[PDB]
Design a protein around this ligand. Structure first.
Ligand code: XYS
Ligand code: XYS
Ligand code: XYS
Ligand code: XYS
Lengths: 287, 289, 288, 287
């Protein structure tokens, strides 16, 4: 149901908000909290494996997570697919396997393989516009259901280019068939993204990821012209802080008693596992 | 080196403490905090996949996590292997694959496949002693490095049998070749496990998992006769509470600003990903024409 | 799509023939030869991994192959699912994952976990009828598309029980919701399976696997009442013989020249990989 | 034991011969026939999955096969690792994972990601010498056991360059630390490869893959100066022919009777599965 659900979110009024996750449990927590969908974060999934976010994990590993989350929740999954895992032929294979796994949208960025993630310091190399437009065209040609979305992510500002270049690239990617564009920035100031949104005059919706420019609200981003806001890695970052503090306290105290009232009870874990339904089906069918 | 490291921990004085994890990042956080090793928790791993802890995930999926953690950290991984994934022949296949993946020890419990999590209420079925002893013998026969450990987990108290039955089973499992035994209990009082520890007289060390009887300290458990203490699911439970609250706050506030100072900074994530070494190696070896 | 295709094969007249395969290439060869569908054989897949056919491979490993075959060919895949990988809760999990991966039908047999391959000698242990009927009921409850099929495999004759017992079990499995039954036997004579078909009065179709009683044709089995005939492991057995002989000849001769005219050319491999389309798409979309 | 075994083969007199395989069964058949080791073939594995040999399969998928073969047989596995799955940092991650899985040697080629099977027509793109030397240096820095081997595969002839270019590339790769070089060629004549061997004066050994120039014997290649000869895809090609003919015959005849005496009996399959030892262990431990 994923791609149909995401199209309905884009076709209805209001700002769409999605949250990063790196396993089915995190996706289920975001769904329960009330997010509209899931972002299958390259950073969260890489970090969960103890590894760089630099196409060190393969498409097989990243798709494995995205697909397991897609089947675990009833909201759409939007996948972070780095640069598309190679050339236009890799992109087509990517689309076929992500679409078949029920992912609603895939996001590819205008860099070359292997991904240099946005937080690497210094000038960064961009893919040429003709080569990246070929990847976008190939993605649209490979998909089977028209509801599936291909999101073209613009790293021009990240890489050291100006807003004119970011808009030139976004307009080319839209012309190549991208269903949405994602303008990225790593400044504290939201102003470069607000400027992009104000100058964007094509019908394709714009996606934003306010990791660094966090002071701007989803409502303000929506009023400025963004359709979807991605909270990409806050679950991971919250988990790291809570788990390291928990482990430190257990070792220092020599027991868990002081943290028992500050962590999830086992009954909450069992609920998140679906144990009520599991036990009912055991009663019905296990003889 | 995991198996050699775990044997050193058991052969040295002091109480060994290990923490549950369900991916390499959790294992690395436990190592950095100072735990002696990792517990590859069936509960944590199944919960992370949104699924019951009931042999719904397969050995393939559980080994994938245990092995990725074993290569990610420099402390031993002790694996929770449910009932051994079938009969003694499945147990042998399990030992071969887990040992090759660098896991230091595997734990199999005296129940029948598929596992019922110990916190399932009501009376639970135990494996017969001859059948489970064969699983233990098969495991010791399949391993290649003598340092590798097979831990026999005793669910007799969980299932509602008495202390003498738990002791009869543990002693049979030790005679069958288990390197250690794990006595489990789900009461809030530590006395049931304390009673087992006082009456255990064999040389094999005893493992305990104080999830429910959490008020007893590791030092007290060690003084009573336990050699290893397992904190099996507190990382998962802490993570669930924090992530839920984070997601709730982001949706309510309309932005993340109010939790930025209460979650790990990006630079901490990068450190945990190994980016210092990665960027050094990029500078050393990645070059153009 | 697989399940609807398989229903169409069962709803139209004629004997359905499927072949065993253990990777997408084998499935594609079976499709090109003209088989109606694929059998995702536990024996072929376990043997391909050098391992016993005894639930040593896990559901994850067996599903990975079945699902990759289902996406690679345009004929339905019928999966060999051993005993269902545990109790009725495991069976439900299996159905959800196999259906999502586009498998058309799953086959579970009335034995206990872990499976003993039907060719293991001596008396074997059967699941109780109530317990197995619970697995069948759970499977039907877990599926989403009504076209998906659950095939109940009867091991009663394999295990040493008589025909009355195989029929009692088959009739119970049909009443529990199985879409088809598979009656197995391992003698050289087809008579035990023919005797079953003579006494089968239920509308559910019957599946047969004539590995040992190979002298009866698919058309003779169909004339006797069977609907689907499974050739379960002949591709693996042919490949083993040919690859062993090829390896021995290369070592003896010192070169491959004497076998070049008797093995597939690389152009055939490229065609099986879809290189014509791959190259066209490179021309259309890979740009500087 | 694999890396030590392969070193012993390279250190002893004689020409090493290995055969391609794409699963543990095929490796076991090569071992039983008497091959010295296994070539974990990118063409055979991709083909077995119905897909192009063009880095469409990922490192995860290719390593899964190579590692399962390495633990299934008692001869060394030499892995076909395409271009190394990205840049020098991908190469390092590859080495760490392949070495931990017991693979004896990895082979990377001097092309850019994603590769094209050498049998693609026209001038092909080579990696620059500095960039590829950096991959080799990284691979050698990442390995832990000195017995593990990194084989530098030279695609210059495949790509339409002359012998002088293939030799100068090989010479640079050897100085960068490659343990052996593989000279590839797709002529029917063996003479280009013989001429490379005559003109190669360096101590690093040379690997050859006589797929197209199949008329030269292993003994003749060894006498000309090659140390290892790879029969890369004959098992797959023999299997395809036999399986297609088997399926055609079953459909035409209506039964398998006419092929029963011409395919492996089930007892041979059981032996290859290890059933004798499996049954003994059943008797020993299953109670
Ligand atoms: O794995 C995570 C769990 O441990 C916790 O942190 O909450 C969300 C999950 O993604
Ligand atoms: O996935 C987890 C991450 O989100 C955090 O919770 O810290 C430890 C990891 O296991
Ligand atoms: O899977 C293959 C089997 O079918 C046969 O062809 O011999 C070699 C194996 O690799
Ligand atoms: O992998 C196999 C290939 O080697 C050949 O044997 O034909 C069928 C395939 O399944």
């Amino acid at each position: 149901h994923g791609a149909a659900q995401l199209r309905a979110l884009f076709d209805a009024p209001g700002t769409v908000r999605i949250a990063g996750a790196h396993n089915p449990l995190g996706a289920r927590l975001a769904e329960r909290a009330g997010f509209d969908g899931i972002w299958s974060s390259g950073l969260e999934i890489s970090a969960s494996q103890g590894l760089p976010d630099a196409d060190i994990l393969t498409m097989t590993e990243l798709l494995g997570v995205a697909g397991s989350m897609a089947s675990a929740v009833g909201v759409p999954v939007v996948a972070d697919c780095d640069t598309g895992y190679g050339n236009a032929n890799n992109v087509m294979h990517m689309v076929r396997r992500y679409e078949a796994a029920g992912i609603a949208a895939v996001t590819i960025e205008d860099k070359r393989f292997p991904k240099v993630n946005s937080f690497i310091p210094g000038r960064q190399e961009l893919a040429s516009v003709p080569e990246f437009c070929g990847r976008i065209e190939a993605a649209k040609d490979a998909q089977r259901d028209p509801d599936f979305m291909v999101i073209a992510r613009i790293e021009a500002l990240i890489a050291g280019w100006d807003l004119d270049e970011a808009l030139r690239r976004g307009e080319a990617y839209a012309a190549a068939g991208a269903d949405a564009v994602l303008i990225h920035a790593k400044s504290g100031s939201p102003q470069p993204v607000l400027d992009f949104l104000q100058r964007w005059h094509l019908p394709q919706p714009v996606v934003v990821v306010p990791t660094t420019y966090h002071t701007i609200s989803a409502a303000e981003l929506g009023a400025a012209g963004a359709k979807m806001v991605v909270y990409a890695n806050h679950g991971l970052r919250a988990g790291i802080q809570a788990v390291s503090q928990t482990f430190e306290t257990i070792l220092k105290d020599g027991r868990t008693t002081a943290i028992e009232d500050h962590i999830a009870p086992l009954t909450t874990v069992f609920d998140l596992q679906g144990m009520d339904e599991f036990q009912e089906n055991e009663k019905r069918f296990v003889r």
